């Protein structure tokens, strides 16, 4: 139970950025963190993953 749900959680974070890069490059969440302005991938994963 621990490892199957950790692997699923980690896979969502890996695919979070390519999903933003190819389908919604100008998404406000992506731009707020890809530009290095405020927030990192881990915090965005807590919101969308």
């Amino acid at each position: 139970s621990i490892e199957i749900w950790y692997a699923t959680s980690e896979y969502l974070r890996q695919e979070m950025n390519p999903n933003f890069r190819m389908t919604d490059p100008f998404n406000p969440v992506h731009m707020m963190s890809f530009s290095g302005a405020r927030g990192n991938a881990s915090q965005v994963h807590q919101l969308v993953g």
């Binding site: 490892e3 199957i4 692997a7 896979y11």
Partner: protein, 83 residues
């Protein structure tokens, strides 16, 4: 520990005689791989091949159907538990 995931929907094709049966830490039957095993996924359009590195657990069986992004292989204190 990194997980190999199926890149396409298809039929898993590999020979089970080149792998050694084992039992995962999750209690599942699996195949231990110690060689450069080649696994074939017969997808909808083109037959695809996936390379499984050695010292890895192969969690699928031959002729099994797999979905995309589905884990097919896994590469790689004292606590008291009460029942």
């Amino acid at each position: 520990a990194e997980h190999v995931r199926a890149p396409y929907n298809g039929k898993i094709k590999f020979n089970e005689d080149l792998v050694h049966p084992t039992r995962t830490r999750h209690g599942h039957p699996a195949f231990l791989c110690y060689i450069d095993l080649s696994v074939i996924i017969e997808s909808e359009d083109i037959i695809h091949s996936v390379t499984i590195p050695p010292k890895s657990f192969l969690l699928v069986q031959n002729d099994q159907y797999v979905e995309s992004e589905q884990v097919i292989a896994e590469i790689r204190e004292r606590v008291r538990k009460y029942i």
